[PDB]
Amino acid sequence: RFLKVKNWETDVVLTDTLHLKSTLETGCTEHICMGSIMLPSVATKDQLFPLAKEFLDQYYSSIKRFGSKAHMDRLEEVNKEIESTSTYQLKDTELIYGAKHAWRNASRCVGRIQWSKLQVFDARDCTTAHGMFNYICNHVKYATNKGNLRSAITIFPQRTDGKHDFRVWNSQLIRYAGYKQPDGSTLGDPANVQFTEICIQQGWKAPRGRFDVLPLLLQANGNDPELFQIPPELVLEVPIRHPKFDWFKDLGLKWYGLPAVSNMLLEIGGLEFSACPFSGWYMGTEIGVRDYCDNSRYNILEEVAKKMDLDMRKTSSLWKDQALVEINIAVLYSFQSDKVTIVDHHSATESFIKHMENEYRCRGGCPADWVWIVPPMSGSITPVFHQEMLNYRLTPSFEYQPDPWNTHVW
Amino acid sequence: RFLKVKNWETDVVLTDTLHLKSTLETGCTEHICMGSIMLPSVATKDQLFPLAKEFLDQYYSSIKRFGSKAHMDRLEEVNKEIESTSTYQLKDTELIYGAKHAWRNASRCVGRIQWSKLQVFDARDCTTAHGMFNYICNHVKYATNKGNLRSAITIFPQRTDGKHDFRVWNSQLIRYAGYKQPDGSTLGDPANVQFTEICIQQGWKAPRGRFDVLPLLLQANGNDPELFQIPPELVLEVPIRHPKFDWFKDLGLKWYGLPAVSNMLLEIGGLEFSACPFSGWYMGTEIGVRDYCDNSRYNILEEVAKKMDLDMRKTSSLWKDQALVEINIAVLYSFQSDKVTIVDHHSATESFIKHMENEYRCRGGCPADWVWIVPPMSGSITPVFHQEMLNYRLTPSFEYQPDPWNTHVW
Ligand code: HEM
Ligand code: HEM
Ligand SMILES: N=C(Nc1cccc(CNCCc2ccc(-c3ccccc3)cc2CN)c1)c1cccs1
Ligand SMILES: N=C(Nc1cccc(CNCCc2ccc(-c3ccccc3)cc2CN)c1)c1cccs1
Ligand SMILES: C[C@H](O)[C@H](O)[C@H]1CNc2nc(N)[nH]c(=O)c2N1
Ligand SMILES: C[C@H](O)[C@H](O)[C@H]1CNc2nc(N)[nH]c(=O)c2N1
Ligand SMILES: [Zn+2]
C-alpha cells in the first residue's frame, strides 16, 4: 500500500502513495501485464457529481482552501447545476488547473517537468468550424513563438449529448500528407494516407509531393467537418542538415517545428473535451528515429546508409544503427542552428528523472509508462531505462478517442 | 478471455489463449502496472501434488499420451511418493521437458526460438562442491564447443528441507572481478565488487586487474561454499577489435564468450532446483551496451568517444550514441572473426517475432516482457519494439532467488 520504485543506476528508492488516488484501470490484472499494449481498454448525471466532487476536492486542496466555504458553495453550485442540466461548466481557473494536471498525469509524456508552464486557450465559446480555425491558428502562432516554442492547449466546448462533439480530425495540427503511388509505393507520410484521402474526399486539392502540410478538418457542434489551410507563414519548418556530412542537404529532408496533438480527449471533472489540441516541442528522436526511420513512416535508413557508404550486406554491420545516430545528430543540429526549440533524448530523460523526484517528494508519486518514456534509441545510456516506474491512471487526463470518421453520424 | 496482441509495423494480430493456463501472479493489478519493476513479488506436501499433477498433465499431453495408463500410473506413483517423502523425483525425460519449458516460458528471454535445442545435464547425483566443480567444468567445455556455442543447463539436486540447498554463489559461471581502488574508483567490473570480496573472504588470492575471471563459489547440500578456479583453457575469451578503427585494440577490451547464468532457481512440477546454471550465447548488446557502457559497469563511453575525437561538450552532439554504435560493431566483428557464436540485436529480435508467431500458432501464445525483450539500443528500428506482448507467468519457470550469502545459516 506504499510501493517502492528503484533506480538501478543510482540505487535511489522512491515511495509511491499517489497510486492510491488512482481511479481508472490499467488493463493489467494479477495474472497478465498489458504494459506493452498500445491502446488499453454518453455520460449520465448519476455518475457526474462523484467525478466533479473528486476534481473539485483536488482543485480546492491545491489552492489551500480544501473544505472552506468557497469550496462547499462551489460543490453545491456544481451539484445544483448538474441537477438542472445534467452537466456543468468549469471556472476558467478550474479549466486551467485541470488541463495542467491532465498533462501532469500523462504517464507516457517524458516532457512533464514543464507541466505547470502550460498556456491554456479557452475556446469554449467557439460555435463553428471557422471559429475553430481561427482559434487553432492563434494557437499555432502563439505556441511557435518564432521558434522559441511555448507549450499550449486550446480547449473547445465540452461534449454534451454526444452527437454535438467538437473534433479536430487531424491527428496533429501540422502533419505532412501521404499518397500511394501508381507503383504502390508511398509519397510523403504513409501514416496519414487515409486522412490525406479523407481531405481529398471532402475536397482537398493536393500538391502530391512529400512534405505537403495537410489542411485542417474541423468539426463543430457535431456538424460535418470543413477544410481549412493554415497560413503557410504560421507553419515553421526546419531544413535538416548535418554538421559534418554536406550531402545530408541533398537528402532534402525537412520537418515542422511544432508538434501539436489534436486527436485526444481531455477529461476534467467528468467533463469531456473531445477537441483539445495541445503542443509542446519535439524530442529529437520523435523525428529522427520514429518519423524518419520507422519502416511504416518515411523509412529513410536505406538512403542515409547508402550516402554514408556503409556495409549494408550484413545485418550485423549495424549499418542501420550507425545511420540512425547520424540522422538524429542532423535533426538536433538543424533545429538548434535555427533557434527552434528541441530537446535531445539525454536532456529530456534526465529532466524526467528530476521531475520524478519532485513528484514523489511533493505529490507522493508520478505515474510513468516505461514503455513510452524510454527513447526509441540509446535506451540504456539514458537514465530512465534504469528507472523503475509505476504506471497508473490519475485524473484529469488525456484519453485516446475513436477517429471521428469511424463514429460520426455523417 | 481471448486476448489480442498487435504488431504496429506489420498490422499482424495474434490471439493469446495461453495466458489462461497462467498460474503465478505478475505484480500488476487492475489499478497499477508494474511491468518495469525489475523484481516483482520451504514447501509442503499439501501444495505439492497439485503442482506435480499440473506438470505431469502437461508432460503427458506433450507426448500424445494425456490420460493414458502410463500417465495415470505416473500420477499415482508421484502421489504415493509425495505421500511417503513429502517430495518426489522427476524422470530424466520429465527433467529435460521441464528445463526446456522453463526456458520456453522465460518471458524476458529474446533467445527462445532455440528453446527446444537445450542440452540438459543431469547433476542430481552430485553430493559435494568438488562434484559441482566437475559438473560445471564439463558444462563450460560442452557449451563453449570451441566457439560453436551450444545451449546447455546443468541441474543439481532439488531443494529438500531448505537448509540443504545446492547453490552456485556466482551470478554467472564466468564473470570478471571487481575491486575498489584506493582512490575510490573501481577496477574490473563494479557489479561484482561484493562477490569479489566474498571470494577474498573465503580465501581467494586476487590478481587485482581488470578482466580477472572470478573463481567458483559452490555450496553443496547446504554446507559452506568452496572456491574453485575454472581451468583457464576452458574460458574462451574474445579480444575486442574494430574492423575500421585500429586504436580500438589499444582500448584493450576483451569479454568471455560464454554467458552462463548460475544464480536462478528452476521450478519444475513444484520441485525447486536452486542450482541450475544455464548458458546460451550472447546477444551483442549485452556486452557492447550494458556491460561496457552502463554507468555502473565498465562505463567506457568516455574513452571511446575520446579516441573518436567526438564533440563531448554538448549532450546534444549525441557523442554517446555515436560511440555506443561503434562499440557494438566492434563486439560483433570481434566475435564473428573468431568464429565465436554471437547474435546481433536485429537478427535476434527478428527471430523472436518469428518465434512468437510459432508459439501463438502451435501453443496459443508466448509470454513476453517487452521491457526486457526490446534491446537496450536501437529500440524502434528492431521489430519487437513495434510488437505488443502479453506478459504472464507459466510454469516450469526460472525464478530469481535471494543471494546465498543473505540467507545461508553459515
Ligand atoms: C513541452 C515539451 C514536451 C515534450 C518534450 C514532450 C515529450 C513527449 C514525447 C516524446 C511523447 C511520446 C510521443 C510519441 O512517442 O508519440 C509524449 C507523449 C505525450 N505527451 Fe508530451 N511532451 C511535451 C509537451 C506536452 C504537453 C504540453 C502536453 C499536454 C498538454 C503533453 C501530453 C502528452 C500526452 C498525453 C502524451 C501521451 C500520448 C499518447 O499516449 O499517444 N505533452 N510527450
Ligand atoms: C541461446 C541463446 C540465448 C540468447 C541469445 C538469449 C538472450 C537473452 C537476453 C539478451 C536476455 C536478457 C538478459 C539480460 O539483459 O540480462 C535473456 C534473458 C533470459 N534468458 Fe535467454 N538467451 C539465450 C539462451 C537462454 C537459455 C539456454 C536459457 C535457459 C535454459 C535462457 C533463459 C533466460 C532467462 C530465464 C532470462 C531472464 C533473466 C532475468 O530475468 O534476469 N536463455 N536472454
Ligand atoms: N513532442 C510531442 N510529441 C507527441 C506527444 C504526444 C503524442 C504524440 C503522438 N502520439 C501518437 C502515437 C501514435 C498513435 C497512433 C498510431 C497509429 C494509430 C493507428 C494506426 C497506426 C498507428 C501511431 C502512433 C505512433 N506510431 C506526439 C508533442 C506534441 C504535442 C505536445 S508534445
Ligand atoms: N545471453 C545471455 N544473457 C543472459 C541471460 C539471462 C540472464 C542474464 C543476466 N541477467 C541479470 C540481469 C541483472 C540482474 C541483477 C542485477 C542487479 C542485482 C542487484 C544489484 C544490482 C544489479 C543487474 C542485472 C543487469 N543490470 C544474461 C545468457 C546467459 C545464459 C544463457 S543466455
Ligand atoms: C507495441 C508497443 O507498445 C508500441 O510500439 C509502443 C512502444 N513504445 C512507444 N513509445 C513511444 N514514445 N511512442 C510509441 O509510439 C511507442 N510505441
Ligand atoms: C528499471 C528497468 O526495469 C530495468 O532497467 C530493466 C529494463 N530492461 C532490461 N532489459 C534487459 N534485457 N536487461 C535488463 O537488465 C533490463 N533492465
Ligand atoms: Zn502491467
Side-chain angles (χ1 to χ4, degrees):
Chain A
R1 207 85 290 228
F2 317 96
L3 305 167
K4 312 290 189 68
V5 293
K6 181 172 179 183
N7 184 306
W8 300 86
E9 190 166 66
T10 64
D11 290 291
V12 163
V13 172
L14 308 185
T15 298
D16 188 294
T17 59
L18 188 65
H19 72 275
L20 301 186
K21 309 299 275 299
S22 155
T23 162
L24 237 161
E25 303 187 46
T26 51
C28 302
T29 70
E30 285 83 343
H31 295 90
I32 188 158
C33 174
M34 292 203 161
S36 66
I37 303 306
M38 173 108 65
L39 319 157
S41 280
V42 64
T44 99
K45 38 174 187 164
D46 308 295
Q47 330 151 326
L48 217 62
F49 186 69
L51 292 151
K53 171 161 196 305
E54 173 202 357
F55 169 82
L56 283 178
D57 281 302
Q58 56 189 258
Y59 174 66
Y60 278 91
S61 198
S62 82
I63 61 184
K64 315 295 179 55
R65 283 133 141 251
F66 166 49
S68 76
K69 193 64 164 56
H71 177 191
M72 288 306 135
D73 293 311
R74 181 87 182 105
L75 208 78
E76 185 107 356
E77 167 176 58
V78 171
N79 209 334
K80 282 169 179 175
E81 174 171 5
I82 292 182
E83 296 284 345
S84 172
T85 44
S86 54
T87 185
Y88 69 101
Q89 297 295 141
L90 294 168
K91 301 298 180 203
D92 297 348
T93 45
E94 295 157 2
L95 189 74
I96 293 157
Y97 171 93
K100 276 173 187 197
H101 278 73
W103 183 12
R104 189 184 191 172
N105 293 331
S107 62
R108 292 177 161 175
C109 181
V110 71
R112 290 180 278 160
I113 203 189
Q114 286 266 4
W115 73 268
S116 64
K117 256 208 174 181
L118 181 64
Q119 178 60 37
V120 181
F121 287 117
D122 183 359
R124 287 176 303 165
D125 62 351
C126 196
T127 65
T128 66
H130 285 67
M132 289 176 77
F133 175 63
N134 194 45
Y135 265 112
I136 288 171
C137 290
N138 293 345
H139 181 140
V140 170
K141 191 163 206 192
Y142 172 93
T144 301
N145 194 27
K146 305 182 233 270
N148 189 13
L149 271 39
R150 295 179 293 200
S151 309
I153 184 163
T154 296
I155 296 173
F156 292 104
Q158 63 207 46
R159 161 170 297 127
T160 52
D161 52 11
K163 57 199 237 184
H164 289 90
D165 293 357
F166 283 70
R167 288 301 298 274
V168 182
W169 286 38
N170 309 64
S171 39
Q172 297 174 28
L173 296 189
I174 298 175
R175 270 198 127 171
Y176 292 130
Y179 331 85
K180 2 201 53 176
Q181 289 293 71
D183 68 309
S185 71
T186 298
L187 175 55
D189 196 335
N192 308 310
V193 172
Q194 203 197 81
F195 182 75
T196 294
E197 292 166 4
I198 290 183
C199 300
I200 299 160
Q201 294 305 287
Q202 300 309 128
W204 198 44
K205 298 268 82 211
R208 298 197 120 73
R210 204 127 91 120
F211 301 107
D212 312 332
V213 180
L214 291 141
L216 298 161
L217 243 193
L218 308 182
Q219 150 173 345
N221 209 43
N223 299 285
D224 295 338
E226 305 164 13
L227 289 173
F228 307 84
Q229 163 194 116
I230 305 142
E233 59 265 42
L234 296 184
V235 178
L236 175 62
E237 297 183 294
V238 175
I240 310 298
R241 64 278 193 187
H242 196 275
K244 315 292 178 171
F245 307 142
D246 273 275
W247 50 263
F248 212 98
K249 309 150 177 32
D250 288 314
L251 284 179
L253 307 167
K254 66 160 161 166
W255 202 253
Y256 47 92
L258 181 77
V261 172
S262 59
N263 55 2
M264 291 193 77
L265 189 148
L266 168 53
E267 204 173 292
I268 299 170
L271 299 179
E272 291 185 343
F273 301 91
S274 42
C276 56
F278 59 86
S279 60
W281 46 85
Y282 267 117
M283 189 167 68
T285 56
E286 304 185 68
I287 303 166
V289 177
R290 301 304 313 285
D291 297 327
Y292 281 157
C293 295
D294 270 8
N295 274 307
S296 73
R297 298 293 304 290
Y298 276 70
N299 188 32
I300 73 170
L301 277 174
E302 298 263 15
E303 271 284 56
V304 171
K306 298 217 172 159
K307 266 100 180 199
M308 294 183 57
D309 208 55
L310 294 175
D311 190 342
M312 293 178 59
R313 303 161 287 195
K314 283 74 185 175
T315 64
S316 35
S317 68
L318 304 186
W319 63 269
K320 285 197 189 181
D321 318 68
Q322 219 161 14
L324 179 69
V325 171
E326 293 309 330
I327 292 169
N328 282 268
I329 291 176
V331 178
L332 291 181
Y333 175 79
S334 304
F335 273 62
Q336 291 160 331
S337 300
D338 287 357
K339 229 80 179 64
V340 181
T341 300
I342 192 157
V343 60
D344 63 82
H345 46 292
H346 297 108
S347 206
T349 54
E350 181 196 346
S351 85
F352 184 76
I353 296 298
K354 191 166 160 284
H355 171 60
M356 248 178 128
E357 297 167 12
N358 297 327
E359 296 288 81
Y360 276 83
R361 196 161 35 83
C362 72
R363 201 197 188 192
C366 180
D369 188 337
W370 196 97
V371 166
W372 277 67
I373 296 293
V374 175
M377 66 173 280
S378 313
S380 60
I381 68 151
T382 78
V384 289
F385 177 94
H386 304 291
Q387 177 67 58
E388 290 172 358
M389 294 165 200
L390 294 173
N391 195 16
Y392 45 92
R393 299 257 253 191
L394 298 181
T395 187
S397 64
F398 289 102
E399 303 299 329
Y400 298 113
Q401 61 190 338
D403 287 328
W405 50 89
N406 300 135
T407 55
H408 182 232
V409 177
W410 186 252
Chain B
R1 207 85 290 228
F2 317 96
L3 305 167
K4 312 290 189 68
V5 293
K6 181 172 179 183
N7 184 306
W8 300 86
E9 190 166 66
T10 64
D11 290 291
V12 163
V13 172
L14 308 185
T15 298
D16 188 294
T17 59
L18 188 65
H19 72 275
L20 301 186
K21 309 299 275 299
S22 155
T23 162
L24 237 161
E25 303 187 46
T26 51
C28 302
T29 70
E30 285 83 343
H31 295 90
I32 188 158
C33 174
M34 292 203 161
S36 66
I37 303 306
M38 173 108 65
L39 319 157
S41 280
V42 64
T44 99
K45 38 174 187 164
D46 308 295
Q47 330 151 326
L48 217 62
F49 186 69
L51 292 151
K53 171 161 196 305
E54 173 202 357
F55 169 82
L56 283 178
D57 281 302
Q58 56 189 258
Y59 174 66
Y60 278 91
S61 198
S62 82
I63 61 184
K64 315 295 179 55
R65 283 133 141 251
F66 166 49
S68 76
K69 193 64 164 56
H71 177 191
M72 288 306 135
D73 293 311
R74 181 87 182 105
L75 208 78
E76 185 107 356
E77 167 176 58
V78 171
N79 209 334
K80 282 169 179 175
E81 174 171 5
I82 292 182
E83 296 284 345
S84 172
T85 44
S86 54
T87 185
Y88 69 101
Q89 297 295 141
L90 294 168
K91 301 298 180 203
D92 297 348
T93 45
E94 295 157 2
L95 189 74
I96 293 157
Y97 171 93
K100 276 173 187 197
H101 278 73
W103 183 12
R104 189 184 191 172
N105 293 331
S107 62
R108 292 177 161 175
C109 181
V110 71
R112 290 180 278 160
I113 203 189
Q114 286 266 4
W115 73 268
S116 64
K117 256 208 174 181
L118 181 64
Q119 178 60 37
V120 181
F121 287 117
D122 183 359
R124 287 176 303 165
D125 62 351
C126 196
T127 65
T128 66
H130 285 67
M132 289 176 77
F133 175 63
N134 194 45
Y135 265 112
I136 288 171
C137 290
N138 293 345
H139 181 140
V140 170
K141 191 163 206 192
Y142 172 93
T144 301
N145 194 27
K146 305 182 233 270
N148 189 13
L149 271 39
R150 295 179 293 200
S151 309
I153 184 163
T154 296
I155 296 173
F156 292 104
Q158 63 207 46
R159 161 170 297 127
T160 52
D161 52 11
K163 57 199 237 184
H164 289 90
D165 293 357
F166 283 70
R167 288 301 298 274
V168 182
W169 286 38
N170 309 64
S171 39
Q172 297 174 28
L173 296 189
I174 298 175
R175 270 198 127 171
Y176 292 130
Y179 331 85
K180 2 201 53 176
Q181 289 293 71
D183 68 309
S185 71
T186 298
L187 175 55
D189 196 335
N192 308 310
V193 172
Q194 203 197 81
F195 182 75
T196 294
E197 292 166 4
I198 290 183
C199 300
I200 299 160
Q201 294 305 287
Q202 300 309 128
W204 198 44
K205 298 268 82 211
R208 298 197 120 73
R210 204 127 91 120
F211 301 107
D212 312 332
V213 180
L214 291 141
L216 298 161
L217 243 193
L218 308 182
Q219 150 173 345
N221 209 43
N223 299 285
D224 295 338
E226 305 164 13
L227 289 173
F228 307 84
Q229 163 194 116
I230 305 142
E233 59 265 42
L234 296 184
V235 178
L236 175 62
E237 297 183 294
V238 175
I240 310 298
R241 64 278 193 187
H242 196 275
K244 315 292 178 171
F245 307 142
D246 273 275
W247 50 263
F248 212 98
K249 309 150 177 32
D250 288 314
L251 284 179
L253 307 167
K254 66 160 161 166
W255 202 253
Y256 47 92
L258 181 77
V261 172
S262 59
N263 55 2
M264 291 193 77
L265 189 148
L266 168 53
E267 204 173 292
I268 299 170
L271 299 179
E272 291 185 343
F273 301 91
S274 42
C276 56
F278 59 86
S279 60
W281 46 85
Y282 267 117
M283 189 167 68
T285 56
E286 304 185 68
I287 303 166
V289 177
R290 301 304 313 285
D291 297 327
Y292 281 157
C293 295
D294 270 8
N295 274 307
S296 73
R297 298 293 304 290
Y298 276 70
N299 188 32
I300 73 170
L301 277 174
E302 298 263 15
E303 271 284 56
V304 171
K306 298 217 172 159
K307 266 100 180 199
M308 294 183 57
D309 208 55
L310 294 175
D311 190 342
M312 293 178 59
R313 303 161 287 195
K314 283 74 185 175
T315 64
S316 35
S317 68
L318 304 186
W319 63 269
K320 285 197 189 181
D321 318 68
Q322 219 161 14
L324 179 69
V325 171
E326 293 309 330
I327 292 169
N328 282 268
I329 291 176
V331 178
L332 291 181
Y333 175 79
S334 304
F335 273 62
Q336 291 160 331
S337 300
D338 287 357
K339 229 80 179 64
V340 181
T341 300
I342 192 157
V343 60
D344 63 82
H345 46 292
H346 297 108
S347 206
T349 54
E350 181 196 346
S351 85
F352 184 76
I353 296 298
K354 191 166 160 284
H355 171 60
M356 248 178 128
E357 297 167 12
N358 297 327
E359 296 288 81
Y360 276 83
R361 196 161 35 83
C362 72
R363 201 197 188 192
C366 180
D369 188 337
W370 196 97
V371 166
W372 277 67
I373 296 293
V374 175
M377 66 173 280
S378 313
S380 60
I381 68 151
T382 78
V384 289
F385 177 94
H386 304 291
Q387 177 67 58
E388 290 172 358
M389 294 165 200
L390 294 173
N391 195 16
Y392 45 92
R393 299 257 253 191
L394 298 181
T395 187
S397 64
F398 289 102
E399 303 299 329
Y400 298 113
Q401 61 190 338
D403 287 328
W405 50 89
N406 300 135
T407 55
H408 182 232
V409 177
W410 186 252

